[PDB]
Design an enzyme around this catalytic site. Structure first.
Site, PDB file in Angstrom:
ATOM      1  N   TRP A 155       0.802  -1.222   0.000  1.00  0.00           N
ATOM      2  CA  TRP A 155       0.000   0.000   0.000  1.00  0.00           C
ATOM      3  C   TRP A 155       0.836   1.274   0.000  1.00  0.00           C
ATOM      4  O   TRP A 155       0.272   2.360  -0.149  1.00  0.00           O
ATOM      5  CB  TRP A 155      -0.946   0.021   1.213  1.00  0.00           C
ATOM      6  CG  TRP A 155      -1.844  -1.180   1.283  1.00  0.00           C
ATOM      7  CD1 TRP A 155      -1.755  -2.220   2.158  1.00  0.00           C
ATOM      8  CD2 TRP A 155      -2.953  -1.482   0.409  1.00  0.00           C
ATOM      9  NE1 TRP A 155      -2.738  -3.159   1.892  1.00  0.00           N
ATOM     10  CE2 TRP A 155      -3.487  -2.724   0.824  1.00  0.00           C
ATOM     11  CE3 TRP A 155      -3.549  -0.817  -0.670  1.00  0.00           C
ATOM     12  CZ2 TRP A 155      -4.596  -3.309   0.201  1.00  0.00           C
ATOM     13  CZ3 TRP A 155      -4.655  -1.400  -1.292  1.00  0.00           C
ATOM     14  CH2 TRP A 155      -5.165  -2.635  -0.850  1.00  0.00           C
ATOM     15  N   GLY A 196      -7.130   5.327   1.521  1.00  0.00           N
ATOM     16  CA  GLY A 196      -5.970   5.562   2.354  1.00  0.00           C
ATOM     17  C   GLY A 196      -6.219   6.632   3.407  1.00  0.00           C
ATOM     18  O   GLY A 196      -5.293   7.359   3.783  1.00  0.00           O
ATOM     19  N   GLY A 197      -7.467   6.761   3.866  1.00  0.00           N
ATOM     20  CA  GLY A 197      -7.781   7.638   4.990  1.00  0.00           C
ATOM     21  C   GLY A 197      -7.622   9.126   4.731  1.00  0.00           C
ATOM     22  O   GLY A 197      -7.444   9.890   5.680  1.00  0.00           O
ATOM     23  N   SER A 247     -12.651   2.591   0.493  1.00  0.00           N
ATOM     24  CA  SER A 247     -12.296   3.273   1.756  1.00  0.00           C
ATOM     25  C   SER A 247     -12.513   4.777   1.596  1.00  0.00           C
ATOM     26  O   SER A 247     -13.655   5.198   1.344  1.00  0.00           O
ATOM     27  CB  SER A 247     -10.876   2.854   2.179  1.00  0.00           C
ATOM     28  OG  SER A 247     -10.667   3.020   3.582  1.00  0.00           O
ATOM     29  N   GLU A 296     -13.696  -6.008   7.942  1.00  0.00           N
ATOM     30  CA  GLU A 296     -13.213  -4.636   7.748  1.00  0.00           C
ATOM     31  C   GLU A 296     -12.322  -4.128   8.883  1.00  0.00           C
ATOM     32  O   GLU A 296     -11.384  -3.362   8.628  1.00  0.00           O
ATOM     33  CB  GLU A 296     -14.399  -3.680   7.610  1.00  0.00           C
ATOM     34  CG  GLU A 296     -15.261  -3.960   6.411  1.00  0.00           C
ATOM     35  CD  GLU A 296     -14.631  -3.358   5.176  1.00  0.00           C
ATOM     36  OE1 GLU A 296     -13.475  -2.862   5.270  1.00  0.00           O
ATOM     37  OE2 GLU A 296     -15.267  -3.411   4.112  1.00  0.00           O
ATOM     38  N   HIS A 314     -10.208  -5.527   5.152  1.00  0.00           N
ATOM     39  CA  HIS A 314     -10.349  -4.258   4.465  1.00  0.00           C
ATOM     40  C   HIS A 314      -9.359  -4.155   3.317  1.00  0.00           C
ATOM     41  O   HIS A 314      -8.157  -4.348   3.509  1.00  0.00           O
ATOM     42  CB  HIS A 314     -10.108  -3.142   5.486  1.00  0.00           C
ATOM     43  CG  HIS A 314     -10.262  -1.761   4.939  1.00  0.00           C
ATOM     44  ND1 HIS A 314     -11.495  -1.175   4.731  1.00  0.00           N
ATOM     45  CD2 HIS A 314      -9.342  -0.811   4.649  1.00  0.00           C
ATOM     46  CE1 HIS A 314     -11.329   0.060   4.290  1.00  0.00           C
ATOM     47  NE2 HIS A 314     -10.033   0.308   4.237  1.00  0.00           N
TER      48      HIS A 314
HETATM   49  C1  LIG Z   1      -9.377   3.560   3.853  1.00  0.00           C
HETATM   50  O1  LIG Z   1      -9.269   4.728   3.067  1.00  0.00           O
HETATM   51  C2  LIG Z   1      -9.232   4.183   5.248  1.00  0.00           C
HETATM   52  C3  LIG Z   1     -10.348   4.614   5.978  1.00  0.00           C
HETATM   53  C4  LIG Z   1     -10.204   5.245   7.223  1.00  0.00           C
HETATM   54  C5  LIG Z   1      -8.873   5.455   7.707  1.00  0.00           C
HETATM   55  C6  LIG Z   1      -8.638   6.102   8.970  1.00  0.00           C
HETATM   56  C7  LIG Z   1      -7.319   6.292   9.420  1.00  0.00           C
HETATM   57  C8  LIG Z   1      -6.228   5.862   8.652  1.00  0.00           C
HETATM   58  C9  LIG Z   1      -6.477   5.233   7.427  1.00  0.00           C
HETATM   59  O2  LIG Z   1      -5.432   4.787   6.579  1.00  0.00           O
HETATM   60  C10 LIG Z   1      -4.273   4.372   7.252  1.00  0.00           C
HETATM   61  C11 LIG Z   1      -3.453   3.627   6.199  1.00  0.00           C
HETATM   62  C12 LIG Z   1      -3.087   2.303   6.882  1.00  0.00           C
HETATM   63  N1  LIG Z   1      -3.706   1.311   6.361  1.00  0.00           N
HETATM   64  C13 LIG Z   1      -2.965   0.845   5.288  1.00  0.00           C
HETATM   65  C14 LIG Z   1      -3.347  -0.579   4.878  1.00  0.00           C
HETATM   66  N2  LIG Z   1      -3.146  -1.459   5.912  1.00  0.00           N
HETATM   67  C15 LIG Z   1      -3.431  -2.680   5.561  1.00  0.00           C
HETATM   68  C16 LIG Z   1      -4.813  -2.804   4.884  1.00  0.00           C
HETATM   69  C17 LIG Z   1      -5.883  -2.893   4.352  1.00  0.00           C
HETATM   70  C18 LIG Z   1      -3.793  -1.097   7.076  1.00  0.00           C
HETATM   71  C19 LIG Z   1      -3.845   0.412   7.401  1.00  0.00           C
HETATM   72  C20 LIG Z   1      -7.822   5.030   6.955  1.00  0.00           C
HETATM   73  N3  LIG Z   1      -8.008   4.410   5.740  1.00  0.00           N
END
Ligand SMILES: *[C@@H](O)c1ccc2cccc(OCCCN3CCN(CC#C)CC3)c2n1
Ligand SMILES: *[C@@H]1O[C@H](CO[C@@H]2O[C@@H](C)[C@@H](O)[C@@H](O)[C@@H]2O)[C@@H](O[C@@H]2O[C@H](CO)[C@@H](O)[C@H](O)[C@H]2NC(C)=O)[C@H](O)[C@H]1NC(C)=O
Ligand SMILES: *[C@@H]1O[C@H](CO[C@@H]2O[C@@H](C)[C@@H](O)[C@@H](O)[C@@H]2O)[C@@H](O[C@@H]2O[C@H](CO)[C@@H](O)[C@H](O)[C@H]2NC(C)=O)[C@H](O)[C@H]1NC(C)=O
Ligand SMILES: *[C@@H]1O[C@H](CO[C@@H]2O[C@@H](C)[C@@H](O)[C@@H](O)[C@@H]2O)[C@@H](O)[C@H](O)[C@H]1NC(C)=O
Ligand SMILES: *[C@@H]1O[C@H](CO[C@@H]2O[C@@H](C)[C@@H](O)[C@@H](O)[C@@H]2O)[C@@H](O)[C@H](O)[C@H]1NC(C)=O
Ligand SMILES: *[C@@H]1O[C@H](CO[C@@H]2O[C@@H](C)[C@@H](O)[C@@H](O)[C@@H]2O)[C@@H](O)[C@H](O)[C@H]1NC(C)=O
Ligand SMILES: CC(=O)N[C@H]1[C@H]([C@H](O)[C@H](O)CO)O[C@@](O)(C(=O)O)C[C@@H]1O
Ligand SMILES: *[C@@H]1O[C@H](CO)[C@@H](O)[C@H](O)[C@H]1NC(C)=O
Length: 526
Positions: free
Chosen positions: A79, A113-114, A195, A322, A435
């Site tokens: 990622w 990616g949040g 996401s 998720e 997720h």
């Molecule tokens: C998805 O867009 C999403 C939704 C909410 C949220 C809230 C806080 C941080 C977020 O992204 C952090 C990136 C880390 N993430 C990367 C992928 N990893 C493995 C999988 C699947 C886990 C965490 C966030 N993202």
């Protein structure tokens, strides 16, 4: 192969895919680089060029903090961005079938990616398989994330908020003005995303400036009404000011703060983003969408409730597990490297990690609703309950509620429950159907037999790809030839959904009914 666009010619490259050819245009710019005085502003229109722009490699990814919690681990590093980070990152990609199509339906991917990470160039977002197999055109763009994409001083055009959402919109605009030259039908454009990308898609359904730039929408594990997805105007200013304090940019003329923040290096802004709030969680989104009065004209829960959105078909869904991905970023007792059996005290401690500003009563109410066991001696009881807490609160129940409310205004909606764990999934088995791990099935990666997916996975992906393409082209996510289960419309009363798995594709009703009544109807009160 050279295509004349409205801003100049671009050169692409030929790709061999499944005994066929796909023409890829990687890295076409769609806005002035948002540099210097343009940092924090809405994306500005692109001036023409007179040469041939070489769209033969992915462009820069936008600035962002990198996941460094498991260096060397493919499950997290798949990622991370795979091109240079730069503020010069407003580019997009186009995959077109060969021979060039006539009036091809267009799929536009918006990564998640949040709102603080992500890039269009990831391997699992490679659109060449969809263009090859279904003869759709696949577009994806980079958009600004974190404070650089969502810093908000409401009303101030130097930092108005929602810049990254305007980046996405300027790219949908680009498809409207230009995609016919690639063989695409601008009148048949389907947004899809996962996401935060799905939350973005749901917000484009709400934004009047986006209503004429697309036809249909697909939302994978995300919607704007998820608790992480929209920042309040109160928090947004508090966080903008806190960022100013941490960088020594505090002023009184709020425009002077922005100018000071414009002379800071991306790294100094990046390293301070985490601390603009007192208590973070693994799900913190410190800089995300706000009600800016421009992209978003009102609090979006009100627009949804009162029918103020684009009337069209939607396809929404979630994955079985998720929440588990986020437990290894903070919850005590969890590890990707053991089975993560936790105790009641560890569960309780985990609630404090994930719900830090929630009353003791609120946290008790979560424990009460998720710990009435069918077997009190089953050892993974608390481990699975915490995963379900995090996934239901943050993803599943908001998606279901979004789908209910959207469908109540007359439009066809289709809801899926993805429950196949990839045979190549690098995370441990207790994390289940994580997720983001439907994305590779949607993009058709299991269709490449060289990639060590099982044959049942090839066929699941093949059916998903057909259903997605049929949704984009015709508004109806059926697979009509291989005697498939018919996907019924999701209505607010019966609430039917389709399960996606290698074994039995089944129709079910009222997913997570009891859990979501807790989150949607009681927990917002605490
Ligand atoms: C998805 O867009 C999403 C939704 C909410 C949220 C809230 C806080 C941080 C977020 O992204 C952090 C990136 C880390 N993430 C990367 C992928 N990893 C493995 C999988 C699947 C886990 C965490 C966030 N993202
Ligand atoms: C943009 O591309 C053209 C065409 O060359 C293509 O890209 C190369 C990486 C290689 O894969 C070629 O086979 C492709 O056809 C570039 O044209 C070249 O330009 C240089 C310098 O002007 C010249 O010496 C070469 O003879 C040209 N032709 C080839 C076949 O290389 C062009 O320069 C590129 N634009 C840039 C780099 O800004
Ligand atoms: C599962 O592992 C967690 C994480 O601990 C780390 O990873 C392990 C795989 C191992 O390499 C440990 O040395 C690492 O610390 C364990 O949680 C820790 O447990 C210890 C026990 O003394 C405790 O002192 C720490 O505070 C815990 N740390 C965290 C972050 O929770 C957990 O105990 C392991 N559980 C099982 C069932 O194996
Ligand atoms: C391209 O098609 C246009 C018709 O628009 C679309 O028809 C289907 C595909 C729906 O998905 C929806 O997008 C529209 O109803 C024509 O008006 C146009 O002239 C065509 N142009 C070319 C070059 O074929
Ligand atoms: C609003 O902001 C207040 C000030 O934040 C403090 O300073 C910044 C730079 C950070 O270091 C932050 O951790 C500090 O707390 C907060 O004290 C206050 O709690 C904030 N309000 C809310 C509701 O969180
Ligand atoms: C449908 O199945 C194809 C291969 O399956 C064969 O053809 C179908 C029509 C049936 O007769 C079946 O019993 C045969 O084994 C695949 O090549 C094709 O990709 C599949 N299409 C979709 C959309 O899944
Ligand atoms: C910031 C950035 O990514 N810059 C450029 C990179 C690197 O500077 C070099 O490859 C050395 O690292 O190279 C290019 O010029 C190239 O010729 O492909 C493209 C790009 O604009
Ligand atoms: C803040 O600075 C800008 C730019 O110099 C100026 O136009 C604006 O009037 C100033 N406002 C205040 C209140 O100082």
């Amino acid at each position: 192969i050279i295509i004349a666009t409205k801003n100049g010619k671009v050169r692409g490259m030929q790709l061999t895919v499944f005994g066929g050819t796909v023409t890829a245009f990687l890295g076409i710019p769609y806005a002035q680089p948002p540099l210097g005085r343009l940092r924090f502003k809405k994306p500005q229109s692109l001036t023409k060029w007179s040469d041939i722009w070489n769209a033969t490699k992915y462009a820069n990814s936008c600035c962002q903090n990198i996941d460094q919690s498991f260096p060397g681990f493919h499950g997290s590093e798949m990622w991370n961005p795979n091109t240079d980070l730069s503020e010069d990152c407003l580019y997009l990609n186009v995959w077109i079938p060969a021979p060039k199509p006539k009036n091809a339906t267009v799929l536009i991917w918006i990564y998640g990616g949040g709102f603080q990470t992500g890039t269009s160039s990831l391997h699992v977002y490679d659109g060449k398989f969809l263009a090859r197999v279904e003869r759709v055109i696949v577009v994806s763009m980079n958009y600004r994330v974190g404070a650089l994409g969502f810093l908000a001083l409401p009303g101030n055009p130097e930092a108005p908020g929602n810049m990254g959402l305007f980046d996405q919109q300027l790219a949908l605009q680009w498809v409207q003005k230009n995609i016919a030259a690639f063989g695409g039908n601008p009148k048949s454009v389907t947004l899809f995303g996962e996401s935060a990308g799905a939350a973005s898609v749901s917000l484009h359904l709400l934004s009047p400036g986006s209503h004429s730039l697309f036809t249909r929408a697909i939302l994978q594990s995300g919607s704007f009404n998820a608790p992480w997805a929209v920042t309040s105007l109160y928090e947004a200013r508090n966080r903008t000011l806190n960022l100013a304090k941490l960088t020594g940019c505090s002023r009184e003329n709020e425009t002077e703060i922005i100018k000071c923040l414009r002379n800071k290096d991306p790294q100094e802004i990046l390293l301070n983003e985490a601390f603009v709030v007192p208590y973070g969680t693994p799900l913190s989104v410190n800089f995300g969408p706000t009600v800016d009065g421009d992209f978003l004209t009102d609090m979006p829960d009100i627009l949804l409730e009162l029918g103020q959105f684009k009337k069209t078909q939607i396809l929404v869904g979630v994955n079985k597990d998720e929440g588990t991905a986020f437990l290894v970023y903070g919850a005590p007792g969890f590890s990707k490297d053991n089975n993560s059996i936790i105790t009641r005290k560890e569960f309780q401690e985990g609630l404090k990690i994930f719900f830090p500003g929630v009353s003791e009563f609120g946290k008790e109410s979560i424990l009460f609703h998720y710990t009435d066991w069918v077997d009190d001696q089953r050892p993974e009881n608390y481990r699975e309950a915490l995963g379900d807490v995090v996934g239901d609160y943050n993803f599943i129940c908001p998606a279901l509620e979004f789908t209910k409310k959207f469908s109540e205004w007359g439009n066809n909606a289709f809801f899926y429950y993805f429950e196949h764990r990839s045979s190549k999934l690098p995370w441990p088995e207790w994390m289940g159907v994580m997720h983001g791990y439907e994305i590779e099935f949607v993009f058709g990666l299991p269709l490449e037999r060289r990639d060590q997916y099982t044959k049942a996975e090839e066929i699941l992906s093949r059916s998903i790809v057909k259903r997605w393409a049929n949704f984009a082209k015709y508004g109806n996510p059926q697979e009509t030839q291989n005697q498939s289960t018919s996907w019924p419309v999701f209505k607010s009363t019966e609430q039917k959904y389709l399960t996606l798995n290698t074994e039995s594709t089944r129709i079910m009703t009222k997913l997570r009914a009891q859990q979501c009544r807790f989150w949607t109807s009681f927990f917002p009160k605490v």
